[PDB]
Amino acid sequence: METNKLGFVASVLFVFVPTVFLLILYIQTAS
Amino acid sequence: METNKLGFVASVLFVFVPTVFLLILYIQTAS
Amino acid sequence: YDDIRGSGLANIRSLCLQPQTFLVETFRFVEGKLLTRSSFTLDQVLTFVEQGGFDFQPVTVQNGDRVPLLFTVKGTIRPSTRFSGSFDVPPYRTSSFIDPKGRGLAVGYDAAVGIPREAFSRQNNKSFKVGTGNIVLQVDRVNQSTGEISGSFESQQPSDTDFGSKPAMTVKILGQFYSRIT
Amino acid sequence: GLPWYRVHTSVLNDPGRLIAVHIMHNALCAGFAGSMLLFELALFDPSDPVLNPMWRQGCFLMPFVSRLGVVNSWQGWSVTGETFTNPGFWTFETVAIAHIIFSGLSFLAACWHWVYWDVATFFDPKTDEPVIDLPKVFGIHLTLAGILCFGFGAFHLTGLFGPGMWVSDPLGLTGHIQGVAPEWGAAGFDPHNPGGVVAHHIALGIVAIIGGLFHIFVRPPEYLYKGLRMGNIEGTLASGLAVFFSGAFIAAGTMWYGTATTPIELWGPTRYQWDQGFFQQAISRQVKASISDGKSPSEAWSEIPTKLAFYDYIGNSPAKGGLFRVGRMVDGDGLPTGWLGHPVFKDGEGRELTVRRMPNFFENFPVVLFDQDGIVRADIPFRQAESKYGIEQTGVTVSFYGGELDGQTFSDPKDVKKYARRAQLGEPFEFDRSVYDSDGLFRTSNRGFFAFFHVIFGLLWFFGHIWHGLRALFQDVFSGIDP
Amino acid sequence: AIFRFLLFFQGFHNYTLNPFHMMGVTGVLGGALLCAIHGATVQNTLFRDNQSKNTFKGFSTDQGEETYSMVTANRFWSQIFGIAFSNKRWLHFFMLFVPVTGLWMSAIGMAGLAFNLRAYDFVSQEIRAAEDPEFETFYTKNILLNEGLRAWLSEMDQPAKKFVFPDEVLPRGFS
Amino acid sequence: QPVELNRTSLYLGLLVVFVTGLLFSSYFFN
Amino acid sequence: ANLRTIPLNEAGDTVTLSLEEFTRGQQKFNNACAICHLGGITKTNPNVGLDTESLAGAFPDRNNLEGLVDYLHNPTTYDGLTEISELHPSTKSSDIYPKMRNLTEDDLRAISGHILLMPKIRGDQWGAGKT
Amino acid sequence: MEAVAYILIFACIIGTLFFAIAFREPPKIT
Amino acid sequence: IDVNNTNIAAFRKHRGLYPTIAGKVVSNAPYDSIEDILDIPGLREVEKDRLQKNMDIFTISDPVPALVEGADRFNNGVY
Ligand code: CLA
Ligand code: CLA
Ligand SMILES: CCCCCCCCCCCCCCCC(=O)OC[C@H](CO[C@@H]1O[C@H](CS(=O)(=O)O)[C@@H](O)[C@H](O)[C@H]1O)OC(=O)CCCCCCCCCCCCCCC
Ligand code: HEM
Ligand SMILES: CC1=C(/C=C/C(C)=C/C=C/C(C)=C/C=C/C=C(C)/C=C/C=C(C)/C=C/C2=C(C)CCCC2(C)C)C(C)(C)CCC1
């Protein structure tokens, strides 16, 4: 499959760079 | 340069998977 | 018909040919599995000339690779007598077939219209050649009271090339046939 | 300040920290400008400006840098083409390095202003609450903007003490940098006139200097102070966001339509130069002028520049890429290696045939060959069972004038069927899609990407304008109405 | 004219494949879901504030008390759907947020279609279907349908262009 | 006041991130 | 105007049709014949259309009003070998097809005259349809 | 590796769905 | 029209040929001689004479296997 190579690394930073932000914000709220 | 391809993705998760952990722990301490 | 509706009793006068095994000589003859429910009865068809009837049955058999073979034969009696012969296998699909990209031979595009010729031209310009198959028909059971003879066959005919896209392989076919000489 | 979407309001009542967080946005903006230009130049191919210009290569910041005066690099080369040895000091690198150094300085200054928030500039003398005088500050800022406008348009664009600006001919072949005299008449409102740009900046610099001086010595009326919530800095944000989204729409429109500020040596042709056949008519007019100058058809058609023929590629229309066909234009059709020449299709009856070019709308198009009458004479069939027309049934031959196939004639059905596909895409060109691993699917230019992004920016800044105007007016009832 | 616009946008733009439009569809369908589910939940968690079977007279404008049990509604949706609203204000902000953001995302998709910046195709599959005349997905059958729409509309859609397509270059599906 | 993010907001944020990423992954891969 | 004028016979005599007569024939086209001749071709066989080029090239030439009425009196082939009035509706054979049992000679004349006084109104919009 | 991204993201939606049902913040009555 | 590659739908074009003449000139194939359609191996005199008028268009050029793969000349499938 002639897919974008960086499409993997675009997919995973698109979805875990915000995610860790949320967890940071949640964890500091819970503590 | 015939370098390991995944050696990039090994380098950056080796050094930011612990890093976010520390920041989580720091931020929840500071708040 | 209601007794055979849902059973499958279908699956020189009407000559029916009932395979029960499909060995493809992959790079030895290995036997796959029948993916087209039961529609392989080449039915209602010294030398014998071919005639009408269902002288074609497209059957896809199955590594995990589907092989769509056009099983076809286009072209005294004792329990030893054999009618060995050869037949001309037409292409699996006729030239009015269209691929997923809009292209075809009798009807369709002549090139890939998705992109804008290149190394695609092996799949672009579709060909319609003809293959040969050798069939050896064995005669085992002869009942002249009805006027009919039956026996087994072996037939070696090529599979589909996808209008010249992939190298076909030879399939071995075995099964009983029964005809009414009249 | 407690919800995550409100956190930056912690500096809303802290103007020293507000200046800090602004200087940090400055540091990020300039560091992005420097790093992006460095990345735009690591990936740039300056070997030829004719068939591989910057707009084919996805250059985003490079056109904006070179539009004012910075066209040459320290490597020798120039986007106009000439290599030399003394490229001034203001090269492509110096600009990116200046922005990187500015970014570092601004990061340090934002650190200082975050730490030293409590300075007696941001608290009035009479009480000690944090305040900034928005009419006074606005007047000072408007005056500063006035001098910068007046100066930029009267000394950098005129070239009196500046490089000038990029000017070009209508065909976009003689693109260079020179200082432009101002145009004060009706001619200054011509979108494709650089003196209008120069005169606009001059006149609006005087206008903004006067308004800024008027917004420093005259206090606002008491009805308009409470009417427009002039004490609320949020209201200032709302009006600035208004200016910001309407400028974005104007910038996007003038990039899509093409003005004197976005010439086609930097951002490439517009889709409207393909829609009306602008370069096609230009070349036909030039060709027929040469034909009537006692030259042969092949001799006239070989004085068409490769850069003038390349503009007739529909692959160079910016309305032909896709949203997720990411990247540069040569990631699509590929690297152009040369102009194949004008194809002239002739039927078996010896009639001039023309392939219908495809519009910007169509992803793929039926190849149909017309004549001087405009009746269909050949085509590349689909049904091919009642197809009275067709290349091989009519025996259509293609003969090229100009370019690499000058004088050559082809009559094979495969070859005519191929060059009739390349003829509907405009002037036929040879493409090597091996240098950039080009997939074959067209991509928009930097003109198209900039226009589309700044339209998205206009839309979200319309909403942000509304959000902050409504928040500025309805400040009293934000938490709720009344019990 | 709007129906022509819709089919033109599929055939020429492949607008169903546009992800901003997919979020628009999601926002609008979720807005309708929220409208229906919130109305029925309120109507079925009402309090007995009257005596007649017609419960529409169990509400006064002047009263300051909730006419429906948010606790019973939270219980019901927690044990039916796994989650439920517990905050009434957040519920009604969500009812605002969902169709508005869907509709805005669809507007972003149209802003992209102004410059022809289209999610028309997946390059990997337009490639694979062209190197493999056996690779058929529903996407490849949408690309074919789009070409069929384009060639069979455009000669009377834009009559200033004077598109002449002979009957034998029009993509048929072998009737 | 310090920033918060309660559990419900965390779950909502995680789903909107995860579903939006699943939506745009097919187009980042192209 | 001249659209009303159609070929009557093979001898050659352009006969004009009243507008009301043409409309009356047009209606009866859409009640007993549009079952499978709606558009310009035949649904039973997609090769024998009701077009000018087909009817002139019929054997015998059936692009005439009297020719079409005589066809309706006797269904034959496109060359006229076997008079198969059973596979087709037929003015004589009302038992197989009861659609023309109420149609008089004027009705047959009008339906045969409306088929040959469209093709210069429409052109490529009746012959085989607009693709 | 394009299916791997899709399956990982789908696993992330499923994990968020489990944790937002199972380990949800309790709604307390006032 | 060729009489070894061409279908029944393009035997319409001739002035009065459909369907028996066309259904019999196609049913037996290939024909080597151009005038081999006129022998009429099972046709009658009304077919024989009428075909004997029409000899100025018939041909024996090339039976293409893409055009003969089992009722492709009778119903190609193009309506
Ligand atoms: C005599 C001296 C002089 C001369 C020769 C010019 C010449 C010019 N000026 Mg001008 N100007 C002058 C003095 C002068 N000015 C003075 C003294 C002032 C102080 C008021 C101004 C303030 C001014 C402004 C604010 C603008 C100009 C602009 C222009 C350029 C207009 C051409 C263009 O691209 O259209 C471009 C813009 C328009 C034709 C107007 C667009 C306004 C739209 C229609 C508003 C609605 C759009 C909405 C917000 C968003 C749409 C959403 C959706 C529905 C699409 C032109 C070259 C325009 C420009 O530079 O464009 C880049 C521009 O916006 N001038
Ligand atoms: C000059 C532009 C500008 C500025 C200074 C502000 C400033 C502010 N906005 Mg705002 N806004 C804007 C434009 C702007 N807005 C636009 C264009 C929109 C529509 C898209 C909005 C819609 C909006 C809403 C709905 C709200 C605000 C709010 C606020 C206030 C709280 C700050 C905050 O949200 O941090 C918090 C943000 C985060 C912690 C993370 C956000 C991450 C984003 C989504 C991704 C970042 C992208 C990238 C890194 C940024 C580069 C952008 C690039 C395109 C240039 C603050 C005063 C809030 C308010 O009213 O205050 C009480 C509020 O609820 N804004
Ligand atoms: C599958 C891989 C992809 C993963 C996708 C899943 C994403 C999850 C994101 C985080 C969501 C949970 C946020 C916090 C919820 C909560 O506080 O729960 C608290 C609960 C107790 O319930 C609670 O307990 C509380 C008291 S106490 O905890 O018991 O002390 C009480 O207050 C409360 O009411 C009660 O509900 O338990 C926990 O401690 C949960 C924290 C576990 C960390 C997240 C899971 C990590 C992944 C596990 C699987 C590893 C995968 C390995 C392969 C890669
Ligand atoms: C009053 C009603 C009708 C009229 C005037 C009419 C007219 C005609 C005519 C003139 C022809 C010969 C045209 C040609 O082949 O060149 C024809 C052929 C044909 N008609 Fe109709 N028709 C009528 C009703 C119908 C109906 C209802 C059907 C539906 C079954 C039908 C099916 C056919 C078919 C299949 C042919 C081709 C048969 C052949 O080749 O001989 N007809 N019709
Ligand atoms: C320290 C210092 C220094 C240095 C500096 C430097 C070196 C720098 C830099 C800088 C840099 C290097 C920068 C930068 C930047 C960039 C940016 C800032 C960007 C961005 C981005 C964005 C914003 C994006 C986002 C996104 C994405 C990712 C895509 C799409 C989507 C989104 C939007 C999400 C000096 C010595 C001088 C001085 C002293 C101090």
**SS in 3 state form for D7-74?**
HHHHHCCCHHHHHHHHHHHHHHHHHHHHHHHHHHHHCCCCCCCCCCCCCCCCCCHHHHHHHHCCCECC
Q: How many whole angstroms separate alpha carbon I59 and alpha carbon I5? A: 9
Contacts of D25 (CB under 8 A, 6+ apart): none
Angstrom distances, CA of residue F9 to CA of A25, D53, E37, H20 = 10, 49, 21, 10
Angstrom distances, CA of residue C150 to CA of C179, D118, D130 = 6, 108, 107
Which residue in chain C is spatially nearest to I77 when comparing CA positions?
C96
Contacts of B28 (CB under 8 A, 6+ apart): A27, A28, A30, A31
Contacts of D449 (CB under 8 A, 6+ apart): D60, E117
Assigned token pair, D301: 């058609």
Q: How many whole angstroms separate alpha carbon C145 and alpha carbon C122? A: 56
Is the bond preceding D343 in cis, omega lying within 30 degrees of 0? no
Q: Letter for the amino acid at G22?
A: F
The three-state secondary structure class of C124 is helix
- The DSSP line for E12-51 is II-GGG-HHHHHHHHHHHHHHHHHHHHHHHHHHSB---SS
Measure E109 CA to ligand 2 centroid, in angstroms.
21
- The DSSP line for G33-80 is TTTT-SSSS-SSSTT--S-HHHHHTSSS---SHHHHHHHHHS---SS-
Q: Would the CB atoms of A1 and E124 count as touching at under 8 Å?
A: yes
Contacts of D475 (CB under 8 A, 6+ apart): D229, D232, D234
Find out whether E126 and D441 touch, Cβ atoms under 8 Å.
Answer: yes
Asked if F6 is an interface residue toward chain E (Cβ–Cβ < 8 A), one would say no
Which residue in chain I is spatially nearest to D388 when comparing CA positions?
I10
Residue D277: name the closest of D359, D352, D344, D369 by CA: D359
Cα dihedral D414, D419, D422, D427 in deg (nearest 10): 170
Q: Where are the beta strands (DSSP E) in chain C?
A: 16-25, 29-31, 56-61, 67-72, 85-89, 131-137, 141-143, 148-158, 170-180
Assigned token pair, G80: 């006229």
Asked if D421 is an interface residue toward chain F (Cβ–Cβ < 8 A), one would say no
Selecting from A6, A7, A25 the residue whose C-beta is nearest the C-beta of F5 gives A25
Best to test chain I binding among E167, E168, E170, E174 (most I CBs inside 10 Å): E174
Assigned token pair, E66: 């909730």
3-state helix, strand, coil in chain I (%, to 5): 25, 0, 75
| Helix or strand run (H / E) with residue I61 | none
Nearest Cα of chain A lies from the Cα of H18 at a distance, in angstroms, of 16
The three-state secondary structure class of G2 is coil
| CATH superfamily entry for domain D271-446 | Photosystem II CP47 reaction center protein (3.10.680.10)
- The DSSP line for E103-162 is HHHHHHHHHHHHTT-B----HHHHHHHHH-TT---TTHHHHHHHHHHHHTTHHHH-TTTT
Does the beta carbon of D244 sit less than 6 angstroms from any atom of ligand 1?
Answer: no
Instruction: Report the neighbours of C using a cutoff of 3 or more CB pairs below 8 angstroms.
Output: D, E, I
Assigned token pair, E161: 């262009």
Half-sphere exposure of D335 (CA within 13 A, CB side): 12
**C131-137/C85-89 β-pairing:** antiparallel
Selecting from D319, D374, D459 the residue whose C-beta is nearest the C-beta of E116 gives D319
Q: How many whole angstroms separate alpha carbon E144 and alpha carbon D105? A: 57
Q: How many whole angstroms separate alpha carbon D405 and alpha carbon D407? A: 6
Residue D452 C-alpha from the chain's centroid: 10
Half-sphere exposure of I25 (CA within 13 A, CB side): 33
Contacts of D171 (CB under 8 A, 6+ apart): D279, D282, D308, D311
> Exposure pattern of A1-31 as b/e (b: 16+ CB <10 Å)?
eebbeebbebbbebbbebbeebbbbbbbbee
Q: Tell me how long chain A is.
A: 31
Find out whether D382 and E169 touch, Cβ atoms under 8 Å.
Answer: yes
Domain ranges of chain G: 1-131
Q: Which of D157, D165, D200 to mutate to test the pocket of ligand 1 (most atoms within 8 A of CB)?
A: D200
Contacts of D240 (CB under 8 A, 6+ apart): none
- The DSSP line for D299-322 is HHTTSS-HHHHHTTBGGG-TTSSB
Find out whether D93 and D115 touch, Cβ atoms under 8 Å.
Answer: no
Which residue in chain C is spatially nearest to D428 when comparing CA positions?
C116
Task: Name the closest-CA residue to atom 3, ligand 1.
Answer: D200
User: D342 a known binding residue?
Assistant: no
User: G73 a known binding residue?
Assistant: no
Half-sphere exposure of E63 (CA within 13 A, CB side): 9
Asked if A18 is an interface residue toward chain F (Cβ–Cβ < 8 A), one would say yes
Assigned token pair, D454: 């700044």
Residue D25: name the closest of D125, D102, D138, D95 by CA: D102
Sign of the C-alpha dihedral, residues D210, D212, D217, D218? positive
- Specify which residues C56 forms β-bridges with: C72
User: G88 a known binding residue?
Assistant: yes
The three-state secondary structure class of D349 is coil
User: F26 phi and psi, to 5 degrees?
Assistant: -60, -25
Q: How many CB pairs under 8 A join C and I?
A: 29
Asked if A23 is an interface residue toward chain B (Cβ–Cβ < 8 A), one would say yes
Assigned token pair, G56: 């002139």
Contacts of C137 (CB under 8 A, 6+ apart): C82, C83, C84, C85, C151, C153, C177
Contacts of E6 (CB under 8 A, 6+ apart): none
Asked if D470 is an interface residue toward chain E (Cβ–Cβ < 8 A), one would say no
Neighbours of E27 (CB within 10 A): 20
Asked if B28 is an interface residue toward chain A (Cβ–Cβ < 8 A), one would say yes
Give the angle subtended at the CA of C58 by the CAs of C56 and C64, to the nearest 5°.
155
Assigned token pair, D162: 């500046």
**Contacts for G85-91: CB closer than 8 Å, 24+ residues apart:** G89/G32, G89/G33
The three-state secondary structure class of C91 is coil
The three-state secondary structure class of B24 is helix
Nearest Cα of chain D lies from the Cα of C99 at a distance, in angstroms, of 13
Find out whether D438 and D330 touch, Cβ atoms under 8 Å.
Answer: yes
Give the angle subtended at the CA of F23 by the CAs of E111 and A26, to the nearest 5°.
105
Find out whether I5 and I61 touch, Cβ atoms under 8 Å.
Answer: yes
| Helix or strand run (H / E) with residue G15 | strand G14-15
Angstrom distances, CA of residue C31 to CA of C132, C157, D256, G28 = 21, 15, 63, 64
Give the angle subtended at the CA of D461 by the CAs of D133 and E93, to the nearest 5°.
100
Find out whether C32 and C22 touch, Cβ atoms under 8 Å.
Answer: yes
Find out whether D350 and C75 touch, Cβ atoms under 8 Å.
Answer: no
Find out whether C120 and C102 touch, Cβ atoms under 8 Å.
Answer: no
- How was it solved? cryo-EM
Assigned token pair, E24: 């628009």
- Specify which residues C104 forms β-bridges with: C98
Nearest Cα of chain E lies from the Cα of A20 at a distance, in angstroms, of 23
**D352-355/G6-7 β-pairing:** unpaired
Which residue in chain I is spatially nearest to E174 when comparing CA positions?
I78
Alpha helices in D312-445 (DSSP H): 391-394, 413-424
Give the angle subtended at the CA of F5 by the CAs of F4 and F11, to the nearest 5°.
175
Nearest Cα of chain E lies from the Cα of H23 at a distance, in angstroms, of 11
Contacts of C61 (CB under 8 A, 6+ apart): C22, C24, C32, C33, C34, C35, C36, C67, C69, C171
Contacts of G126 (CB under 8 A, 6+ apart): G39, G40, G50, G51, G118, G119
- Which chain I positions have a beta carbon within 8 Å of E175's beta carbon? 77-79
Angstrom distances, CA of residue C159 to CA of C25, C26, C60, C163 = 11, 12, 10, 11
Find out whether D30 and D102 touch, Cβ atoms under 8 Å.
Answer: yes
- The DSSP line for D258-297 is --TTS-TTTS---THHHHTTHHHHHHHHHHHHHHTTT--H
Longest Cα separation, chain D? 97
3-state helix, strand, coil in chain F (%, to 5): 75, 0, 25
Q: How many whole angstroms separate alpha carbon D437 and alpha carbon D335? A: 10
Cα radius of gyration rounded to whole Å, chain A: 14
Which residue in chain A is spatially nearest to F1 when comparing CA positions?
A29
Q: How many whole angstroms separate alpha carbon D47 and alpha carbon D42? A: 13
Q: How many whole angstroms separate alpha carbon D387 and alpha carbon D393? A: 9
In E, residues 93-152, which contact A (CB 8 Å cutoff)? 123-124, 127-128
- The DSSP line for D120-153 is TTSB-SSS-SB---HHHHHHHHHHHHHHHHHHII
Assigned token pair, D81: 């083409």
Longest Cα separation, chain G? 39
User: Among all chains, which residue has been given the structure tokens 């292209």?
Assistant: C103
- Which chain I positions have a beta carbon within 8 Å of E174's beta carbon? 77-78
Residue D175: name the closest of D305, D87, D60 by CA: D305
Give the angle subtended at the CA of D13 by the CAs of D11 and D14, to the nearest 5°.
60
- Which chain C positions have a beta carbon within 8 Å of E135's beta carbon? 100
Q: How many whole angstroms separate alpha carbon D440 and alpha carbon C144? A: 69
Assigned token pair, D447: 């003109």
Q: How many whole angstroms separate alpha carbon D251 and alpha carbon G63? A: 66
Q: Letter for the amino acid at C68?
A: P
Neighbours of D113 (CB within 10 A): 20
Q: Angle of helix E88-114 relative to helix D446-473, nearest 10 degrees?
A: 150
Find out whether C30 and C23 touch, Cβ atoms under 8 Å.
Answer: yes
Assigned token pair, D127: 């009480």
Q: How many whole angstroms separate alpha carbon B27 and alpha carbon A28? A: 6
Find out whether G74 and G83 touch, Cβ atoms under 8 Å.
Answer: yes
| Helix or strand run (H / E) with residue D176 | strand D176-178
Contacts of D303 (CB under 8 A, 6+ apart): D286, D290
